[PDB]
UniProtKB/Swiss-Prot annotation, chains A, B:
DNA binds at residues 24, 73, 149, 153-154. It comes from Escherichia coli (strain K12). The temperature- and UV-sensitive allele dnaN159 does not grow at temperatures higher than 37 degrees Celsius. The global SOS response is chronically induced. The UV-sensitivity of dnaN159 is dependent upon Pol IV (dinB), it has an enhanced Pol V-dependent mutation rate (umuC, umuD), and is absolutely dependent on the polymerase activity of Pol I (polA) for viability. Changing residue 133 to T: Reduction of synthesis of beta*, probably due to mutation of its promoter. Changing residue 146 to L: No effect on synthesis of beta*. Residues 245-365 are annotated as: 3. Its main location: cytoplasm. Residues 1-120 are annotated as: 1. Keywords: Cytoplasm, DNA replication, DNA-binding, DNA-directed DNA polymerase, Nucleotidyltransferase, Transferase. Small molecules can bind to the hydrophobic cleft and inhibit binding of various protein factors, suggesting this may make and attractive antibiotic target. This is Beta sliding clamp. GO terms for cellular component: cytosol; DNA polymerase III complex; Hda-beta clamp complex; replication inhibiting complex; replisome. NCBIfam families: dnan (TIGR00663). Induction: Part of the dnaA-dnaN-recF-gyrB operon, but also transcribed from at least 3 promoters within the upstream dnaA gene, induced at 42 degrees Celsius. Induced 1.5-fold by hydroxyurea. A shorter isoform, beta* is induced by UV treatment and also at low levels in late logarithmic/early stationary phase growth (at protein level). Beta* transcription induced by naldixic acid.
Length: 366, 366
């Protein structure tokens, strides 16, 4: 196996395929990248057994077929450490991989390509394409609401749902929920899958928002995303995900609109004097007026008053201010709308200008 | 006690005086800032018992004398969280401190000013002033060579030495040494003190390089730095510091000069395949040529070859590459000079254009 490529044709591929890796995998070959030269293509693959990233780079310079695996970190550091525009010549020689560039020479230990974990083939059941920027928005809008290491393993991930011609993401940790929907101009079957948290993050980081459209293939137990020269595959999470339709408040009859920044900064200050563990704040609403209060076990107190647009009856409600801040931070709109019902019901929050994304936060007794 | 101050006249003072603090001091009052209104001045003080930072802010708005202490973090977060240009009105009311700004109101718990730790008065024995930028350079040039948590406590800090009309800093961890000297245009007694590592960092962070000159006072057990409206005081470290004169190689008869960036990047690549714990690399030198090699327990190997200016006899020498990279990173010069003797002696490294700063790295058997 032999190839010569320009540094800059190798760096991003190396970075992408290293994604699924960790510093020190127990099974050592998982710390390595699979390199394959076939025809006019160099393929690079990294895996953690649950998901895999593949990158293909065209070989315009002389090359010879073959395969081996090399330490990902070392090989990436070498390439990144070389000067901009450097030509990187690689040859397999025994069980060492030789790397030459300019007046620099490196000899890396290898592990047999034959030892590299091969993810089973599977069949695509549902397929569609959409702009990268769209997928990116769908994930960004909801990702923060995913559970982390919950015993409810099905919550440590994101629901990807197809219905009509919409793709929809849903994330919840059992306390707060995020949903975002985008039309993608194709008739789809109704289908739902749970992508694991680490897979969601990997997919997110593979998208640069560019001109290459994202092609998605969903099987019964896997999902694959193809964009440009990168191919990402992840296993799916089993289990039944909550129904976001059941969580959305029914006919909220109270509507608040306010500047997003002003509102966020008020909650952020009030949070300072909220209980450090439970983060409870109170919201008082009345005609065109909003008051936020916070206190803590030290009997310190914060009060924020704000001019808003509010029509319905007066009410107060408590909730976890971190959940509200997460929402306001994710919105990235100028104006925010909150739909309320009463003090024992959830609140729905959205960008005032779009219903694409919706957020649900529970009430909390303070 | 009462005062009203513009947010922007309060932020940097708050940030500075919080420097010596930690999130959760065992002795709770140490998590608080001392506030004092006297005459037309608000004074703020933070301490950790070893060092203290004091800031004074002129009061141009109505005020009333008195003192209390408040939680540093919360009070700073409140101030920083308020809008730009906000006026901040503060009143002590019972054992609460009230903070009002616009439509925001906060009540903070206090602890008696009378409980606040008062660092003993002491006498200045040596004094001088210099530009901030000079002190900043002296510290930046050497700080990375300080020991961290060495059992030799006197190395967890920086020597500040006056001699003739020079101020000199020296830092070493017993493996590598940095020294930097600047003339400051005043006749000084010969004197040396060790400033603790945390104090060095605090002092460095209080210097913005601006027009206010730094006035320094050294006592038998303390050092004080006064700049603009900030006054920093630290206890000194006892013990005898190593003599940098004894560590500098005697009459190095071998001189290498090379581009700093080119040299740094070569060492950085070679380091990739060095032993992860000992970081050993070999340097081979011969007329106008330099070769760097690295290998590790996996028998991987890096080699870098570089055109340099080198006059003396051929030789090779081993050392810890992290120490060399630290030096090259700190130099921030275009050209570097290395002065060598033989394979069992230290190397001296300096910016090729200035002898203000010198670095010594001990050799290592590989």
């Amino acid at each position: 196996m032999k190839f010569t490529v320009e540094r800059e044709h190798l760096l991003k591929p190396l970075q992408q395929v290293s994604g699924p890796l960790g510093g020190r995998p127990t099974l050592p070959i998982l710390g390595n990248l699979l390199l394959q030269v076939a025809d006019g293509t160099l393929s690079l693959t990294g895996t953690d057994l649950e998901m895999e990233m593949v990158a293909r780079v065209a070989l315009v310079q002389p090359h010879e077929p073959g395969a081996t695996t090399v330490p990902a970190r070392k090989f990436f550091d070498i390439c990144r450490g070389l000067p901009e525009g450097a030509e990187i010549a690689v040859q397999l020689e025994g069980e060492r991989m030789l790397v030459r560039s300019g007046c620099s020479r490196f000899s890396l230990s290898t592990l047999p390509a034959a030892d590299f974990p091969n993810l089973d083939d599977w069949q695509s059941e549902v397929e569609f394409t959409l702009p990268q920027a769209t997928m990116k928005r769908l994930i960004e809008a909801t990702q923060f609401s995913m559970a982390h290491q919950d015993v409810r393993y099905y919550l440590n991930g994101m629901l990807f749902e197809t219905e009509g011609e919409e793709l929809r993401t849903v994330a919840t940790d059992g306390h707060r929920l995020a949903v975002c929907s985008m039309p993608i101009g194709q008739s789809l079957p109704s289908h739902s899958v749970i992508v694991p948290r680490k897979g969601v993050i990997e997919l997110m980081r593979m998208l640069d928002g560019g001109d290459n459209p994202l092609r998605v293939q969903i099987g019964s137990n896997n999902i694959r995303a193809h964009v440009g020269d990168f191919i990402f595959t992840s296993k799916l999470v089993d289990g039944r995900f909550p129904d976001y339709r059941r969580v959305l408040p029914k006919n909220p009859d109270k509507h608040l609109e306010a500047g997003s920044d002003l509102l966020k900064q008020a909650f952020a200050r009030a949070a300072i004097l909220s209980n450090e563990k439970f983060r409870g704040v109170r919201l008082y609403v009345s005609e065109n007026q909003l008051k936020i209060t916070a206190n803590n076990p030290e009997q310190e107190e914060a009060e924020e008053c704000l001019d808003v647009t509010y029509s319905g009856a007066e009410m107060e409600i408590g909730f976890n201010v971190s959940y509200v801040l997460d929402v306001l931070n994710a919105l990235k709109s100028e104006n925010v709308r909150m739909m309320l019902t009463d003090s024992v019901s959830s609140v729905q929050i959205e960008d005032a200008a779009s219903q694409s994304a919706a957020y649900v936060v529970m009430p909390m007794r303070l």
